[PDB]
Every structure is written in C-alpha cells, then in structure tokens.
Design a protein that fits this description.
part of a larger assembly, 4 chains, A mainly beta, B alpha+beta, C alpha+beta, D mainly alpha, A: mainly beta, two-stranded antiparallel sheet, two-stranded antiparallel ribbon, 1 helix, 4 strands, C: alpha+beta, Alpha-Beta Plaits, four-stranded antiparallel β-sheet, 2 helices, 6 strands, globular, RNA-binding, Ribosomal_uL23-like (chain C)
Chain lengths: ~60, ~150, ~100, ~60
RNA sequence: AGCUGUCAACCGAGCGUUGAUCCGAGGAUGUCCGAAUGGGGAAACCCGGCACGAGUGAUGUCGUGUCACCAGGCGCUGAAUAUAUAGGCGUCUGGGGGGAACGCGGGGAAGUGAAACAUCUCAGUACCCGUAGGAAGAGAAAACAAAAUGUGAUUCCGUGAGUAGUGGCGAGCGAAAGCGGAGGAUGGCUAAACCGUAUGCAUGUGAUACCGGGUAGGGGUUGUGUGUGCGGGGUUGUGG
RNA sequence: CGUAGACGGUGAGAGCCCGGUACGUGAAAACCCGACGUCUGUCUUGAUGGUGUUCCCGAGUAGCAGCGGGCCCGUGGAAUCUGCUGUGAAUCUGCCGGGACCACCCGGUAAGCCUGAAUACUUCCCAGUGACCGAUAGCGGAUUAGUACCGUGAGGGAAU
RNA sequence: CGUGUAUGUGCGUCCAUGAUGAAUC
C-alpha cells in the first residue's frame, strides 16, 4: 500500500504541522494502486502494486 | 493519450485515425483489446496501424471458416527456412509462430494468426519434418507437417 | 582414509568389585565410546575376542563434580558396556584378573 | 622404528596394515594401563602418535 | 648440550648427532553445537539415496562423502483453455551469520533548557532499521562570483565568525562567499541524417532495385516502415 | 677505553656478570610492492587544419501547484536542494543559476548517464611512551572474572 | 520382527484346467 513493485517508490516521511506549529511525524505514501498487470501480451494477468506515476508512464500494461 | 485506431470504434473514429483519448480509455480498452496502438514514432506507427488492420481482416477465423481451414489442412508438407547447423540441425534462430504462419501462407493460402500455432508443443529444435498443431477453434486442431530446411 | 577399528569403541575395562563379580560370572564390563550402541559394541567385541556375545547392556554414568579452590570441576561422562558372552565363550583374559 | 620416512616408504596397503596393528597395540596398552600392568606408560602416547603419522602419510598420498 | 604447557609437586620416558623442548611458515586431522543447512530439537540428539564392506548358517551395525531455503546459462516440461505463461525438474554459480570503532541511507525520542510550557531546545542526539568498504558519495562544476586579464574536475583542515543572519527575535540557534592549506587530475558512455549488421506485421509488382557518383545490364544485398543491441556514422559550453 | 652508561635481571645503585643495547647481519617456505617477458584494443585503410549556408541531435524530466523536509533562513518577500501528490515543457532564438522580471548581462549546460586514488576509525597484531594508577587505586576483572554470587529473564556483579 | 531348513502347491503356468456378449441386413 506504500511500496511500488516497479520503481520501488516508497513512502516519504515528514511532519504534519498544526496551527500551533506542533510537528508530528507522518508519511507521504505513494499513490500505488492494485493493478492486474499483463507483463507479456500473452494475456495472463498478475496482481501487482504500481504507483500512479508508473501507471501514467505506461510501466503497467493492462493487456 | 495520442493513439492510432487499428480498427473501428463507435463515436471515436475510423480505423487509422489519430485520436487523443483519456489515458484510462486508451489503456483499459483500446490498447488491451487491440483497437489501437499508441501514436509512437510516426514513421513506424503509420504502417503498423494499417498492417494490423489488414492482418486482423485476413487472419480472422469465423465459426464456419474453422471447419473450412480444417478441411483445407489437406495441404502437403510446408517448408520453413531456419538458420541451423548442418550436423545436428540445432536452430541458431529458433522457429517462431510468425515464421510458421509465414511459411504456411507462402505454401498455400490459409492466412492465420500466429497465436493459433502450437510451436512450443511442436518443440522442433532440429532439422527435418516436425508436425505442428494449429488450433483454429475450440474443437478444430489442424495438423500441419512442417519440414525444416537449414540456411 | 578412515580405517575404522572396533577397538576404537572399546576404550578400557572396568576394574572393580562388581566388574570382577561379573567376570567370574562370565560377564565383562568395558568403558565404551559414549556415542556407541549395543549392536555396535556386540559386533566390536565379537570381532576383537572371537567370542559370541549373548547380550550387551550399557549404562551412561555422569562424571562426578569435584570441588577445588577454583570452583567445581566435572569429570568425564562415561558409557559402560556390560557384555554377557555365550555358554562356551572362551573367557576374555585380557582384563588381567 | 616408525619414522615418517619409513612410513612413506611403506605402501598404502602396508600403511593400513600397520595402522590396524598400531590400533590393536593401543587397545592392548589401554587395557594393561587400566589393569595397572603397563610399566612404560609413554607407550600409549608413542603408539597414538604413530597412528597419527600413519593417517598423516595416507592423507598426504590421498592429496598429492 | 635440556625435555615432556601451567596452577603444581609426586612414576615413567624417550632427545644428539636417528638435533632435542622450543620459535616461524605452509599443510593434514579437526567430534558435536552454532548462519547450522538431510529432518527434527529443550544449542551439544534421529534419517534418505550412492558407493564400501561386516561378519556372516544370518539381521541389525559402522566409516566415507551427499541431501535445507532465491536468481542465471546448458537446459527439459508448459496446468487451468490457447498451451504461444505461472509453476515443476536437473545442473552450476552465489547469499544467509558474526565483528570494537569509523561510513552512507532511512526512522527517530524523552529526561533536559526555555527558571512554567506547547513553537523552539534537547537533537537529528540516544536508540532503531538497511547496507557496506578498508575507508566510505560526488565527480571531471543547471558551480561560484560580480563586471576582475576573476576562480575553475572533490573531499577534509583553519579562518571568515559566534559574524551576516536566524529566533514564542525568548532560551537559543547560526552560515556561506572570499582567503590560507592537505591532495592533486579534467575518464568513459555518449543521442543525432545514415549503416555491417538477427528478430515483430505487412509486403512477388518477384524493380522503381539497397549498392555509398555518374553507367551499361539485371532477375539480384529480397525489392518497403521498422523497436530492440553488438560496433560504426562518432561525438562540450566558444558542441557534435 | 664506549662508534654501544637504553631498559631490565642478578643476594643492595652493574656500560664492562646475564638478557640485551649501538650495530657484522639473516628466510627454505608463505604473504605483501617493484624491473623485463607471454597476455590484453585501437591506426597508419586520407580523418586532424582551415572553408563554409541549411537539416537532425538525452522526459513523465525541468517547470508549476498543494503539503512537508533541509538550508542562518521557525513559511517568511523565500531563492537554491529535496520527499509525496497532481499537472506537465525541445534541441541551443533551448534550458538552468546569480535569493522576482525586459532584459545590459554574466556563469553553466540538469533531467539517460555513469565512473578514480589522495580523509575518519581500531576488534586485532608489533614496537614503544607517560611530572598516568599502583591492589578501597588502575579495567568490573594483578587473584576462579564477566568468575563466585543474585535474578525466571533481560540483566546486575564482586572479594581475594 | 528376521535368516538356513523341512511339511504341505491351498491355485496358475509354454500347454490343458472355469466365467463373459464378441459381432452383418
């Protein structure tokens, strides 16, 4: 849910800052979605996790 | 997504038309179902789209055409050239489904899609005659007799 | 090369009053390798002394913990094989009485 | 009379035979020592190291 | 010309000229446990197949090597259907773990200070995670500078400076440019009209042939787009 | 006379008693750096210094926006660097930086790039040193020492 | 639980020795 299986993009870590400027640890998780990718155009799918960046760049083929 | 229609799509355009579609529309419908190819390097894509359309129109096997090609399977031996050694027949360039379709359509005129060829089951890996199954429907499995000739 | 000999399994005899009673009963006590077994001991003794072994009994004895200025030191654990020979069973005189 | 030169002169079969003989001798020496009738208690060590030498020569031949 | 380690004395022995004990280097053996890996396990105990015998009037038994868990050649099969895949099988090469400090990357406290306290500090510390190497990234400047004939591959040290600044402008925090030094050298891919070049789908008109200039033939590089990769075409800021 | 009075030991302050010290010097074997060889790609097969107009040449990246991180810079006028999310540039008349912008300009040519040695540290081994400790000191440990002992355990932990 | 011996062969073999449908309009 936070690691892409293609580029390895993982969650960043930073601080959520409140109005009182309290800084609390939080994560910027990648937008990885469960994609039934088709590696070869043969047809058989495989459920992997790919970031929407990879889905957009075309590193997932839903053939 | 800029893509070239390989076939007809209602309310989208004619086969061979360049269209801008939503990435999801081009990635979940057009590209997967083969109704288009991405508008990649134009020099190649321009011919690729029309070639795909022609291959789809010529290689299509209808229900009746399945039995028609089964009956046509009475063709004799089909020769296939391959770069292999003259001692054992080991194939430097392994046979391919496209190669089998090419040999078949060169010797005779049963146009067919490469995917209907049971090449791995044939497992030629040698020189000589090697029967190959061509599955044209769920119940028709023609058997071609492919001879292998070295280069 | 690993030229195994049955005499590796048989380490020494047991020289004691109970051992000698058993010897006069024609039952010989040996100090055998800890990782031996009764069948192996029987085979080894038969090959060594050309006798027929009726039964082999074995017992593991823990080494005694003795005291010393340094502290407690434990002696070696020993396995003793008690071997009953056959009826004829030419006596094993190598025990030296 | 068990020097490494002599052992190396001896053959593999002869070396194994001397090996078994030394094992029988060590067994006898252990039994005499336990019964209290081994005067030269250094015989045990001499025969043990003779067995070690026979193994060493055999393994040297096995290696090359 | 002494010698069987020592606590640590007490038999037996050999060492000599068949050079001792000892010291150095290279080997052999190296039980069992431990990443522990044949399986199991309460770390120190139970097996399979191979080849040996081991006596045998015979059956356990014993020694030797081998057998745990990912990827890649030689490869072999290709389930569910179409097989043209996942998996299965053989083989081979590697990884498991440990280690005091140092490195890089990441996660990341609270005591504490702010004479309270939350921003802030503590502190990117302690601790943790992943990973090395003998050292660890960049790297051959989308660099700095300021109109100067400016410096010029990168890192560390000293200054600049407790300054500019920053800061509930509180407690505190705190550079860089420049300059002086340590060390010193500017490597390679490289994309690009076209190629020697194997594989996708079309193409038999078997010619607009592909020959790199014209120049006659010619049934020939297969006549026509090509994405991939091994070499070219061949490669810095004042480009090819 | 010592080219060797370093330090120790020896029955009490030893250069000349001993181990040694200054210095006659030494390695079969194994492991570390040198010279010459076998071994490994590129050329003479016209490039190489000049001539000249026109065409082609590094991406989900730069940029931007939101939310953060880190910079003296605590979001501030907030640059440069950077995580995630979204949106997203051509080919030098380009692009980026100089803490906005015409630009007078200057500097440099990111993202597809990658790659070097020269500085920190000491488990361990060798040789040394000390206006360091000298047995309640110095390591917890000169002694059975991470032992005895305590604790279920992590762990604590001596005395001599 | 196994090895070398004897008792029976309790049925079948290379044969014979039973059961089965072995086929046309």
């Amino acid at each position: 849910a936070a690691v892409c299986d293609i580029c390895g993009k993982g969650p960043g870590f930073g601080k959520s800052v409140s109005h009182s400027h309290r800084r609390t640890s939080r994560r910027w998780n990648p937008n990885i979605q469960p994609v039934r990718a088709v590696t070869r155009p043969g047809g058989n799918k495989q459920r992997i996790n790919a970031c929407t960046s990879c889905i957009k760049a075309g590193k997932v083929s839903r053939a | 997504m800029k893509l070239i229609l390989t076939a007809e799509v209602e309310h989208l355009g004619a086969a061979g038309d360049t269209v801008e579609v939503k990435d999801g529309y081009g990635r979940n419908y057009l590209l997967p179902r083969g109704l288009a190819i991405v508008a990649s390097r134009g020099a190649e894509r321009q011919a690729e789209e029309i070639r795909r359309a022609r291959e789809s129109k010529v290689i299509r096997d209808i229900e009746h055409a399945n039995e028609l090609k089964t009956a046509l399977e009475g063709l004799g031996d089909v020769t296939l050239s391959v770069n292999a050694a003259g001692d054992t027949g080991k194939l430097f360039g392994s046979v391919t489904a496209a190669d089998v379709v090419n040999a078949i359509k060169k010797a005779g005129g049963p146009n067919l899609d490469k995917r209907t060829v049971q090449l791995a089951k044939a497992h030629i890996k040698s020189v000589g005659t090697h029967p190959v199954t061509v599955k044209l429907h769920t119940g028709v499995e023609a058997k071609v007799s492919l001879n292998v000739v070295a280069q | 090369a690993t030229i195994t000999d049955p005499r590796d399994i048989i380490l020494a005899p047991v020289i004691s009053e109970k051992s000698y009673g058993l010897i006069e009963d024609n039952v010989y006590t040996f100090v055998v390798h800890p990782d031996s077994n009764k069948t192996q001991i029987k085979i080894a003794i038969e090959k060594i002394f050309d006798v027929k072994v009726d039964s082999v009994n074995t017992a593991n004895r823990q080494g005694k913990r003795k005291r010393t200025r340094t502290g407690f030191g434990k002696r070696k654990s020993t396995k003793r094989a008690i071997v009953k020979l056959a009826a004829g069973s030419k006596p094993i005189d190598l025990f030296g009485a | 009379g068990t020097t490494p030169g002599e052992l190396r002169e001896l053959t593999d079969d002869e070396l194994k035979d001397k090996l078994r003989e030394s094992k029988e001798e060590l067994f006898n020496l252990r039994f005499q020592m336990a019964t209290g009738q081994l005067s030269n208690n250094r015989r045990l060590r001499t025969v043990r190291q003779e067995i070690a030498r026979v193994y060493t020569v055999l393994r040297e031949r096995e290696l090359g």
